[PDB]
Amino acid sequence: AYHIDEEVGFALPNPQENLPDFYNDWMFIAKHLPDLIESGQLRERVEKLNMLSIDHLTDHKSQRLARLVLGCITMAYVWGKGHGDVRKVLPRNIAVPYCQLSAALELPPILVYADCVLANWKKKDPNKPLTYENMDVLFSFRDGDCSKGFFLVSLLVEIAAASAIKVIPTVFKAMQMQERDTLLKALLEIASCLEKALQVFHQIHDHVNPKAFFSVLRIYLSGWKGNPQLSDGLVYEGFWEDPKEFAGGSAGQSSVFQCFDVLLGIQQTAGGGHAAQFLQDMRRYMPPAHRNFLCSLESNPSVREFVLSKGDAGLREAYDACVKALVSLRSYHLQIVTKYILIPASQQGTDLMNFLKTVRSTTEKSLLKE
Ligand code: HEM
Ligand SMILES: Nc1ccccc1C(=O)C[C@H](N)C(=O)O
């Protein structure tokens, strides 16, 4: 069904918090990364784990939790305290089950958005709503890392986007039914929800401190693709013989922007030399069912062409409201990357800026006007 929820969208609805007692040894380490890292006992605990079979993970929610658990342990093992003391070999007894589970779930054996954000959360009270005050994350890395604020605000933007995502079938049906008003309603509804998502994005400032993000959390989200600290990638002991590179790119692995890029025929899949290659690569790091969803949307008739073919200024204005909301979102995201990467980096990206500025202006160049 593309694993897309009416309420939470690309987020994993109501994730599992507990594994079977079989996996308690995994569970304990993941639940205690702040103390084990700080006290310098983490790597020993990982290095003294026994081989635990994944055959006792009986369903998707259990596999997603195990993947989040092993991904957090792996990031902590590789990066340690976060200050250059690195491990380049992931011990056999983590690496083999982590890589087996990853293959089953068709995701790379590294921490991704779909683990640390889409699966990493709970309601404090199951009867209060999906708001920040009623929610928590399941795992953090270090005390003060602001992982609660970063993951939960990302999740809440994701949940806000769900309201626009569930309208997408109405769009294609209305094109196909030849239902002009239904299509116009739907596009205005999508834009309205995307605007609401932009409002939710503002909570980022209330809960994430630029020093903590840039200097702590960013470290544990860092990968080994093009990383000088791990120039040949990571050795997954006992599974592949030579090291492999995978990006640690959690923020950029949301499907939300690409979801509406593709819906509105904005051309970034194919296009820019280095911008389109980056956007296509980050798809490798999305759950397969979401990869599938983005592809099926590309195969559908073009909404942008349909609107263009109609000589209908009302349609063109609803379409442009969607494109505007997507520009607003990337423009605000530009501001945040300035606040949370660029300024702290200088207090010690021009390629990073150019990538984001490019995707925004390509989105901006898509407005119809006429
Ligand atoms: C909170 C919700 C967020 C969402 C939904 C989101 C979404 C995205 C998306 C879709 C991209 C791909 C570029 C594009 O499509 O325009 C991207 C890139 C990026 N975002 Fe975010 N983002 C969020 C928050 C953040 C935050 C708080 C930071 C803090 C610095 C950040 C840092 C980055 C970086 C560095 C990139 C470039 C890819 C990379 O090098 O990792 N993002 N983001
Ligand atoms: N801060 C942590 C550090 C390490 C492991 C878990 C956490 C949590 O966030 C626990 C959360 N209160 C929960 O409801 O599971």
Side-chain angles (χ1 to χ4, degrees), residues 241-303:
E241 191 213 342
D242 300 328
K244 298 214 166 280
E245 291 196 285
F246 303 101
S250 290
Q253 297 154 350
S254 179
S255 318
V256 166
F257 293 2
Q258 297 205 39
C259 173
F260 293 100
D261 272 347
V262 153
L263 172 76
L264 305 166
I266 307 184
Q267 307 300 346
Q268 265 140 359
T269 304
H274 289 333
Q277 276 315 296
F278 186 78
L279 291 183
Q280 255 282 333
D281 179 35
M282 278 307 105
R283 303 236 190 142
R284 299 272 83 231
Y285 297 86
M286 301 179 196
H290 299 168
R291 263 132 71 189
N292 296 336
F293 176 72
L294 294 179
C295 282
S296 99
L297 285 196
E298 300 193 77
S299 312
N300 282 356
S302 168
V303 158

Short mmCIF file of all heavy atoms in Angstrom, two decimals, residues 241-303:
data_model
loop_
_atom_site.label_atom_id
_atom_site.label_comp_id
_atom_site.label_asym_id
_atom_site.label_seq_id
_atom_site.Cartn_x
_atom_site.Cartn_y
_atom_site.Cartn_z
N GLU A 241 33.90 -8.43 2.62
CA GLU A 241 35.32 -8.48 2.96
C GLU A 241 35.97 -7.11 2.89
O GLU A 241 36.75 -6.73 3.78
CB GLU A 241 36.04 -9.47 2.06
CG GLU A 241 37.45 -9.77 2.51
CD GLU A 241 38.37 -10.03 1.33
OE1 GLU A 241 37.85 -10.30 0.22
OE2 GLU A 241 39.61 -9.93 1.51
N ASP A 242 35.66 -6.34 1.87
CA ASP A 242 36.20 -4.99 1.75
C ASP A 242 35.23 -3.97 2.31
O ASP A 242 34.02 -4.22 2.41
CB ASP A 242 36.52 -4.68 0.28
CG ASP A 242 37.53 -5.65 -0.32
OD1 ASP A 242 38.41 -6.15 0.42
OD2 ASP A 242 37.44 -5.91 -1.53
N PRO A 243 35.72 -2.80 2.70
CA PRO A 243 34.82 -1.79 3.28
C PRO A 243 33.86 -1.26 2.23
O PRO A 243 34.09 -1.37 1.03
CB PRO A 243 35.76 -0.69 3.78
CG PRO A 243 37.06 -0.92 3.09
CD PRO A 243 37.13 -2.39 2.78
N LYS A 244 32.76 -0.69 2.72
CA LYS A 244 31.76 -0.07 1.86
C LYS A 244 31.41 1.32 2.40
O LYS A 244 31.41 1.56 3.61
CB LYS A 244 30.49 -0.92 1.76
CG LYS A 244 30.70 -2.30 1.14
CD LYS A 244 29.47 -2.72 0.34
CE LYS A 244 29.74 -3.91 -0.57
NZ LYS A 244 30.43 -3.49 -1.81
N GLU A 245 31.13 2.23 1.47
CA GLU A 245 30.77 3.59 1.80
C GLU A 245 29.25 3.74 1.75
O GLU A 245 28.60 3.19 0.85
CB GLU A 245 31.42 4.58 0.83
CG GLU A 245 32.94 4.71 0.98
CD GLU A 245 33.48 5.95 0.28
OE1 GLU A 245 33.55 5.95 -0.96
OE2 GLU A 245 33.82 6.95 0.96
N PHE A 246 28.70 4.46 2.73
CA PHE A 246 27.30 4.87 2.76
C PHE A 246 27.25 6.24 3.39
O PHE A 246 28.00 6.52 4.33
CB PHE A 246 26.41 3.89 3.54
CG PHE A 246 26.45 2.49 3.03
CD1 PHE A 246 27.21 1.53 3.68
CD2 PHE A 246 25.75 2.13 1.90
CE1 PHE A 246 27.26 0.25 3.21
CE2 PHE A 246 25.79 0.85 1.42
CZ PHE A 246 26.55 -0.10 2.08
N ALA A 247 26.38 7.09 2.87
CA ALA A 247 26.27 8.43 3.40
C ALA A 247 25.50 8.42 4.70
O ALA A 247 24.58 7.61 4.90
CB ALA A 247 25.57 9.36 2.41
N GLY A 248 25.90 9.29 5.61
CA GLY A 248 25.08 9.58 6.75
C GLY A 248 24.36 10.88 6.48
O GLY A 248 24.93 11.96 6.69
N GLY A 249 23.13 10.80 5.98
CA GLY A 249 22.45 11.99 5.51
C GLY A 249 21.06 12.26 6.03
O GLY A 249 20.22 12.80 5.29
N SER A 250 20.82 11.96 7.31
CA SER A 250 19.46 11.83 7.82
C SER A 250 18.49 12.94 7.45
O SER A 250 17.38 12.66 6.99
CB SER A 250 19.51 11.64 9.34
OG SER A 250 20.04 10.36 9.66
N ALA A 251 18.87 14.21 7.60
CA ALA A 251 17.90 15.26 7.31
C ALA A 251 17.45 15.25 5.84
O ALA A 251 16.25 15.35 5.53
CB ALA A 251 18.48 16.62 7.72
N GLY A 252 18.41 15.09 4.92
CA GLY A 252 18.11 15.12 3.50
C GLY A 252 17.40 13.91 2.95
O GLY A 252 17.10 13.88 1.75
N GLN A 253 17.11 12.91 3.80
CA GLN A 253 16.48 11.68 3.33
C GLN A 253 14.96 11.66 3.51
O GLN A 253 14.34 10.63 3.24
CB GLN A 253 17.11 10.49 4.04
CG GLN A 253 18.56 10.34 3.71
CD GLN A 253 19.30 9.64 4.80
OE1 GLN A 253 18.76 9.43 5.88
NE2 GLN A 253 20.56 9.28 4.54
N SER A 254 14.35 12.75 3.94
CA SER A 254 12.90 12.84 3.89
C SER A 254 12.43 12.70 2.45
O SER A 254 13.09 13.14 1.51
CB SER A 254 12.42 14.17 4.48
OG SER A 254 11.00 14.26 4.42
N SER A 255 11.28 12.06 2.28
CA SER A 255 10.64 11.93 0.98
C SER A 255 9.66 13.06 0.69
O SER A 255 9.13 13.12 -0.43
CB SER A 255 9.89 10.60 0.88
OG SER A 255 10.64 9.54 1.43
N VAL A 256 9.45 13.97 1.65
CA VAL A 256 8.36 14.95 1.55
C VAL A 256 8.58 15.92 0.39
O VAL A 256 7.69 16.13 -0.44
CB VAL A 256 8.17 15.71 2.88
CG1 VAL A 256 7.28 16.94 2.64
CG2 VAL A 256 7.58 14.81 3.93
N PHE A 257 9.75 16.56 0.33
CA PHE A 257 9.97 17.52 -0.74
C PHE A 257 9.91 16.84 -2.11
O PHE A 257 9.22 17.31 -3.02
CB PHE A 257 11.30 18.25 -0.55
CG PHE A 257 11.34 19.16 0.65
CD1 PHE A 257 10.26 19.26 1.51
CD2 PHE A 257 12.48 19.92 0.93
CE1 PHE A 257 10.30 20.09 2.63
CE2 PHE A 257 12.53 20.76 2.05
CZ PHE A 257 11.43 20.84 2.91
N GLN A 258 10.60 15.70 -2.26
CA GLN A 258 10.55 14.97 -3.52
C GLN A 258 9.14 14.50 -3.85
O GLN A 258 8.75 14.44 -5.03
CB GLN A 258 11.51 13.79 -3.48
CG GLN A 258 12.94 14.19 -3.32
CD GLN A 258 13.86 13.14 -3.88
OE1 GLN A 258 13.57 12.56 -4.91
NE2 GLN A 258 14.95 12.87 -3.18
N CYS A 259 8.37 14.12 -2.83
CA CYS A 259 6.98 13.76 -3.05
C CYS A 259 6.24 14.85 -3.83
O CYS A 259 5.57 14.57 -4.83
CB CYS A 259 6.28 13.49 -1.72
SG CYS A 259 4.50 13.25 -1.88
N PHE A 260 6.37 16.11 -3.40
CA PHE A 260 5.66 17.19 -4.05
C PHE A 260 6.40 17.76 -5.25
O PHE A 260 5.74 18.26 -6.17
CB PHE A 260 5.31 18.27 -3.01
CG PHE A 260 4.33 17.77 -2.02
CD1 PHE A 260 4.75 17.34 -0.77
CD2 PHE A 260 3.01 17.60 -2.38
CE1 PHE A 260 3.84 16.79 0.13
CE2 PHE A 260 2.09 17.06 -1.50
CZ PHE A 260 2.50 16.65 -0.24
N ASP A 261 7.73 17.68 -5.28
CA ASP A 261 8.48 17.90 -6.51
C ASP A 261 7.93 17.03 -7.65
O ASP A 261 7.65 17.53 -8.74
CB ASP A 261 9.94 17.55 -6.30
CG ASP A 261 10.74 18.71 -5.80
OD1 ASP A 261 10.24 19.85 -5.85
OD2 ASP A 261 11.88 18.46 -5.36
N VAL A 262 7.82 15.73 -7.41
CA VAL A 262 7.39 14.85 -8.48
C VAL A 262 5.92 15.08 -8.80
O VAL A 262 5.53 15.13 -9.97
CB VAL A 262 7.69 13.38 -8.12
CG1 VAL A 262 6.74 12.45 -8.82
CG2 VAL A 262 9.11 13.04 -8.53
N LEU A 263 5.09 15.25 -7.78
CA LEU A 263 3.66 15.47 -8.01
C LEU A 263 3.43 16.65 -8.95
O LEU A 263 2.59 16.58 -9.85
CB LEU A 263 2.94 15.72 -6.68
CG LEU A 263 1.48 16.14 -6.85
CD1 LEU A 263 0.63 14.93 -7.21
CD2 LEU A 263 0.94 16.84 -5.60
N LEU A 264 4.19 17.73 -8.77
CA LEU A 264 4.01 18.94 -9.54
C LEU A 264 4.94 19.00 -10.74
O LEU A 264 5.24 20.10 -11.21
CB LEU A 264 4.22 20.16 -8.65
CG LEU A 264 3.38 20.27 -7.37
CD1 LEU A 264 3.95 21.34 -6.45
CD2 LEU A 264 1.91 20.54 -7.66
N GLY A 265 5.41 17.86 -11.23
CA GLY A 265 6.29 17.82 -12.39
C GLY A 265 7.51 18.72 -12.34
O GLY A 265 8.02 19.12 -13.40
N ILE A 266 8.00 19.06 -11.15
CA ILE A 266 9.24 19.82 -11.02
C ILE A 266 10.43 18.91 -11.32
O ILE A 266 10.56 17.83 -10.72
CB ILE A 266 9.36 20.45 -9.63
CG1 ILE A 266 8.10 21.26 -9.30
CG2 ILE A 266 10.62 21.28 -9.51
CD1 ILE A 266 8.19 22.00 -7.98
N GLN A 267 11.30 19.33 -12.23
CA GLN A 267 12.31 18.45 -12.83
C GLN A 267 13.61 18.56 -12.04
O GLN A 267 14.48 19.37 -12.34
CB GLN A 267 12.53 18.79 -14.30
CG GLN A 267 11.27 18.82 -15.18
CD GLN A 267 10.51 17.49 -15.22
OE1 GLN A 267 11.04 16.45 -14.81
NE2 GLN A 267 9.27 17.53 -15.71
N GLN A 268 13.74 17.70 -11.03
CA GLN A 268 14.99 17.52 -10.33
C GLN A 268 15.48 16.07 -10.31
O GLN A 268 16.68 15.85 -10.09
CB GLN A 268 14.87 18.02 -8.88
CG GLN A 268 15.35 19.44 -8.68
CD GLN A 268 14.45 20.20 -7.73
OE1 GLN A 268 13.46 19.67 -7.23
NE2 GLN A 268 14.78 21.46 -7.48
N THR A 269 14.60 15.09 -10.53
CA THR A 269 15.03 13.70 -10.68
C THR A 269 16.13 13.59 -11.74
O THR A 269 17.27 13.22 -11.43
CB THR A 269 13.83 12.82 -11.07
OG1 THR A 269 12.78 12.96 -10.10
CG2 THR A 269 14.23 11.34 -11.18
N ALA A 270 15.80 13.92 -12.98
CA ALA A 270 16.77 14.20 -14.02
C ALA A 270 16.91 15.71 -14.19
O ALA A 270 15.91 16.44 -14.15
CB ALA A 270 16.36 13.56 -15.35
N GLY A 271 18.14 16.17 -14.37
CA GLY A 271 18.39 17.60 -14.50
C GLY A 271 19.82 17.97 -14.17
O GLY A 271 20.75 17.51 -14.85
N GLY A 272 20.01 18.78 -13.13
CA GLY A 272 21.31 19.27 -12.70
C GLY A 272 22.40 18.21 -12.68
O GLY A 272 22.12 17.03 -12.44
N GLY A 273 23.63 18.61 -12.95
CA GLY A 273 24.74 17.68 -12.88
C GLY A 273 24.86 17.04 -11.51
O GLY A 273 24.70 15.82 -11.37
N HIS A 274 25.11 17.87 -10.49
CA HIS A 274 25.38 17.37 -9.15
C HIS A 274 24.18 17.49 -8.21
O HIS A 274 24.17 16.84 -7.16
CB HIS A 274 26.59 18.10 -8.55
CG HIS A 274 27.89 17.73 -9.19
ND1 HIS A 274 28.11 16.51 -9.79
CD2 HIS A 274 29.05 18.43 -9.33
CE1 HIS A 274 29.34 16.47 -10.27
NE2 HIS A 274 29.93 17.62 -10.00
N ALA A 275 23.18 18.30 -8.56
CA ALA A 275 21.98 18.41 -7.73
C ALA A 275 21.05 17.22 -7.92
O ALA A 275 20.55 16.65 -6.95
CB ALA A 275 21.25 19.72 -8.04
N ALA A 276 20.81 16.84 -9.18
CA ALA A 276 19.94 15.71 -9.45
C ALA A 276 20.58 14.39 -9.02
O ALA A 276 19.89 13.48 -8.57
CB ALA A 276 19.58 15.67 -10.93
N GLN A 277 21.91 14.28 -9.16
CA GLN A 277 22.58 13.07 -8.70
C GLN A 277 22.45 12.92 -7.19
O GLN A 277 22.23 11.81 -6.69
CB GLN A 277 24.06 13.09 -9.11
CG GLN A 277 24.32 12.61 -10.52
CD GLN A 277 23.56 11.33 -10.87
OE1 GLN A 277 23.79 10.27 -10.28
NE2 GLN A 277 22.65 11.43 -11.83
N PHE A 278 22.56 14.03 -6.45
CA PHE A 278 22.41 13.95 -5.00
C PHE A 278 20.99 13.56 -4.62
O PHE A 278 20.78 12.72 -3.74
CB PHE A 278 22.80 15.27 -4.35
CG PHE A 278 22.80 15.23 -2.83
CD1 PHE A 278 23.87 14.64 -2.14
CD2 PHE A 278 21.74 15.74 -2.10
CE1 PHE A 278 23.87 14.58 -0.74
CE2 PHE A 278 21.74 15.70 -0.69
CZ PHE A 278 22.80 15.11 -0.02
N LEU A 279 19.99 14.14 -5.30
CA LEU A 279 18.61 13.86 -4.95
C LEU A 279 18.24 12.43 -5.28
O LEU A 279 17.46 11.79 -4.56
CB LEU A 279 17.67 14.84 -5.68
CG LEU A 279 17.72 16.30 -5.24
CD1 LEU A 279 16.70 17.11 -6.01
CD2 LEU A 279 17.48 16.46 -3.74
N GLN A 280 18.80 11.89 -6.36
CA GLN A 280 18.50 10.52 -6.72
C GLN A 280 19.21 9.56 -5.77
O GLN A 280 18.65 8.52 -5.41
CB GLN A 280 18.89 10.26 -8.17
CG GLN A 280 17.70 10.18 -9.16
CD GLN A 280 16.93 8.84 -9.12
OE1 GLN A 280 17.50 7.79 -8.78
NE2 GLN A 280 15.65 8.87 -9.48
N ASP A 281 20.43 9.89 -5.34
CA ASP A 281 21.14 8.98 -4.45
C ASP A 281 20.43 8.87 -3.11
O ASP A 281 20.35 7.77 -2.54
CB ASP A 281 22.58 9.44 -4.22
CG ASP A 281 23.33 8.51 -3.25
OD1 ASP A 281 23.07 7.27 -3.26
OD2 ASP A 281 24.11 9.03 -2.41
N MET A 282 19.91 9.99 -2.59
CA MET A 282 19.24 9.95 -1.30
C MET A 282 18.00 9.07 -1.31
O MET A 282 17.51 8.70 -0.24
CB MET A 282 18.88 11.37 -0.84
CG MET A 282 20.04 12.12 -0.19
SD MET A 282 20.80 11.18 1.16
CE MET A 282 22.33 10.62 0.40
N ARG A 283 17.51 8.70 -2.50
CA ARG A 283 16.41 7.74 -2.58
C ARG A 283 16.85 6.35 -2.14
O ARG A 283 16.02 5.58 -1.65
CB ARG A 283 15.88 7.69 -4.01
CG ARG A 283 15.42 8.99 -4.56
CD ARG A 283 14.00 8.84 -5.01
NE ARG A 283 13.54 10.00 -5.76
CZ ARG A 283 12.75 9.93 -6.82
NH1 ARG A 283 12.36 8.77 -7.33
NH2 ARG A 283 12.33 11.06 -7.39
N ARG A 284 18.12 6.00 -2.31
CA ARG A 284 18.59 4.70 -1.87
C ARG A 284 18.39 4.52 -0.37
O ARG A 284 18.36 3.39 0.12
CB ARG A 284 20.08 4.51 -2.19
CG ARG A 284 20.50 4.55 -3.67
CD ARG A 284 20.40 3.20 -4.34
NE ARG A 284 19.03 2.92 -4.77
CZ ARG A 284 18.36 1.81 -4.48
NH1 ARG A 284 18.93 0.81 -3.81
NH2 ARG A 284 17.09 1.70 -4.87
N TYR A 285 18.23 5.62 0.36
CA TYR A 285 18.20 5.63 1.81
C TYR A 285 16.79 5.76 2.37
O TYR A 285 16.64 5.89 3.59
CB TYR A 285 19.05 6.78 2.34
CG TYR A 285 20.51 6.65 1.99
CD1 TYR A 285 21.00 7.13 0.77
CD2 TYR A 285 21.39 6.04 2.85
CE1 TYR A 285 22.34 6.99 0.44
CE2 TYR A 285 22.71 5.90 2.53
CZ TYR A 285 23.18 6.37 1.34
OH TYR A 285 24.51 6.22 1.06
N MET A 286 15.77 5.75 1.53
CA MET A 286 14.37 5.78 1.87
C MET A 286 13.82 4.37 1.88
O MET A 286 14.29 3.52 1.13
CB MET A 286 13.58 6.61 0.86
CG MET A 286 14.05 8.03 0.78
SD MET A 286 13.13 8.99 -0.44
CE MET A 286 14.22 10.39 -0.62
N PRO A 287 12.84 4.06 2.74
CA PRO A 287 12.20 2.73 2.72
C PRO A 287 11.77 2.36 1.31
O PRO A 287 11.36 3.23 0.53
CB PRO A 287 10.99 2.90 3.65
CG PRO A 287 11.36 4.04 4.56
CD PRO A 287 12.29 4.95 3.79
N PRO A 288 11.88 1.08 0.93
CA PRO A 288 11.54 0.69 -0.46
C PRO A 288 10.14 1.09 -0.88
O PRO A 288 9.95 1.58 -2.00
CB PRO A 288 11.71 -0.84 -0.45
CG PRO A 288 11.70 -1.23 0.99
CD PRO A 288 12.32 -0.08 1.73
N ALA A 289 9.16 0.88 -0.01
CA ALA A 289 7.79 1.24 -0.34
C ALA A 289 7.65 2.72 -0.65
O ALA A 289 6.75 3.12 -1.40
CB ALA A 289 6.86 0.85 0.80
N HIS A 290 8.53 3.56 -0.09
CA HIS A 290 8.50 4.98 -0.39
C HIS A 290 9.26 5.29 -1.67
O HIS A 290 8.85 6.17 -2.45
CB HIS A 290 9.06 5.78 0.78
CG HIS A 290 8.29 5.58 2.05
ND1 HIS A 290 8.76 6.00 3.28
CD2 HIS A 290 7.09 4.99 2.28
CE1 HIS A 290 7.87 5.69 4.21
NE2 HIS A 290 6.85 5.08 3.63
N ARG A 291 10.37 4.61 -1.91
CA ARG A 291 10.96 4.60 -3.24
C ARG A 291 9.92 4.25 -4.30
O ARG A 291 9.79 4.94 -5.31
CB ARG A 291 12.11 3.59 -3.27
CG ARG A 291 13.47 4.18 -3.07
CD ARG A 291 14.21 3.39 -2.05
NE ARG A 291 14.62 2.07 -2.52
CZ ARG A 291 15.13 1.14 -1.73
NH1 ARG A 291 15.35 1.37 -0.44
NH2 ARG A 291 15.43 -0.06 -2.23
N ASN A 292 9.16 3.18 -4.06
CA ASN A 292 8.14 2.76 -5.02
C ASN A 292 7.10 3.85 -5.23
O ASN A 292 6.65 4.07 -6.37
CB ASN A 292 7.44 1.49 -4.53
CG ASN A 292 8.38 0.30 -4.44
OD1 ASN A 292 9.41 0.24 -5.11
ND2 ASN A 292 8.01 -0.68 -3.61
N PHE A 293 6.70 4.52 -4.15
CA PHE A 293 5.66 5.55 -4.24
C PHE A 293 6.13 6.71 -5.11
O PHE A 293 5.40 7.19 -5.98
CB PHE A 293 5.28 6.01 -2.84
CG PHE A 293 4.28 7.14 -2.82
CD1 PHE A 293 2.95 6.91 -3.16
CD2 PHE A 293 4.66 8.42 -2.45
CE1 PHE A 293 2.03 7.95 -3.14
CE2 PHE A 293 3.75 9.46 -2.42
CZ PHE A 293 2.43 9.23 -2.77
N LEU A 294 7.37 7.17 -4.89
CA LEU A 294 7.89 8.28 -5.67
C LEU A 294 7.95 7.94 -7.16
O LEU A 294 7.73 8.82 -8.00
CB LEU A 294 9.27 8.69 -5.16
CG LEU A 294 9.33 9.29 -3.75
CD1 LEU A 294 10.75 9.62 -3.40
CD2 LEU A 294 8.45 10.53 -3.69
N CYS A 295 8.23 6.67 -7.49
CA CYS A 295 8.32 6.20 -8.87
C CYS A 295 6.95 6.13 -9.52
O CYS A 295 6.76 6.61 -10.64
CB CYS A 295 9.00 4.82 -8.91
SG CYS A 295 10.81 4.80 -8.76
N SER A 296 5.98 5.52 -8.85
CA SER A 296 4.63 5.49 -9.38
C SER A 296 4.09 6.90 -9.65
O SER A 296 3.40 7.10 -10.65
CB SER A 296 3.69 4.76 -8.41
OG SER A 296 2.97 5.70 -7.63
N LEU A 297 4.39 7.87 -8.79
CA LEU A 297 3.98 9.25 -9.07
C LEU A 297 4.61 9.79 -10.34
O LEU A 297 3.99 10.61 -11.03
CB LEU A 297 4.34 10.18 -7.90
CG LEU A 297 3.56 10.16 -6.60
CD1 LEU A 297 3.89 11.41 -5.84
CD2 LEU A 297 2.05 10.04 -6.81
N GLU A 298 5.85 9.40 -10.64
CA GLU A 298 6.51 9.88 -11.86
C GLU A 298 5.89 9.25 -13.09
O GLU A 298 5.94 9.84 -14.17
CB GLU A 298 8.01 9.59 -11.82
CG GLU A 298 8.70 10.25 -10.65
CD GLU A 298 10.22 10.25 -10.77
OE1 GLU A 298 10.76 11.07 -11.54
OE2 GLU A 298 10.87 9.46 -10.05
N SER A 299 5.32 8.05 -12.95
CA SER A 299 4.73 7.34 -14.08
C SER A 299 3.33 7.83 -14.40
O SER A 299 2.84 7.58 -15.51
CB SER A 299 4.70 5.84 -13.79
OG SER A 299 5.96 5.39 -13.32
N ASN A 300 2.69 8.50 -13.46
CA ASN A 300 1.35 9.00 -13.68
C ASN A 300 1.37 10.18 -14.65
O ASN A 300 2.41 10.81 -14.86
CB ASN A 300 0.73 9.44 -12.35
CG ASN A 300 0.24 8.27 -11.54
OD1 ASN A 300 0.29 7.13 -11.99
ND2 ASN A 300 -0.24 8.55 -10.33
N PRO A 301 0.23 10.47 -15.28
CA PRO A 301 0.12 11.67 -16.11
C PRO A 301 0.55 12.92 -15.34
O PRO A 301 0.34 13.04 -14.13
CB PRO A 301 -1.36 11.72 -16.48
CG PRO A 301 -1.83 10.29 -16.38
CD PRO A 301 -0.99 9.63 -15.32
N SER A 302 1.15 13.86 -16.07
CA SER A 302 1.73 15.05 -15.47
C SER A 302 0.63 16.03 -15.08
O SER A 302 -0.15 16.50 -15.92
CB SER A 302 2.71 15.72 -16.42
OG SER A 302 3.05 17.02 -15.96
N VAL A 303 0.58 16.33 -13.78
CA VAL A 303 -0.30 17.37 -13.27
C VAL A 303 0.04 18.72 -13.90
O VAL A 303 -0.86 19.48 -14.28
CB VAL A 303 -0.20 17.39 -11.73
CG1 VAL A 303 -0.63 18.71 -11.15
CG2 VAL A 303 -0.99 16.23 -11.15
#
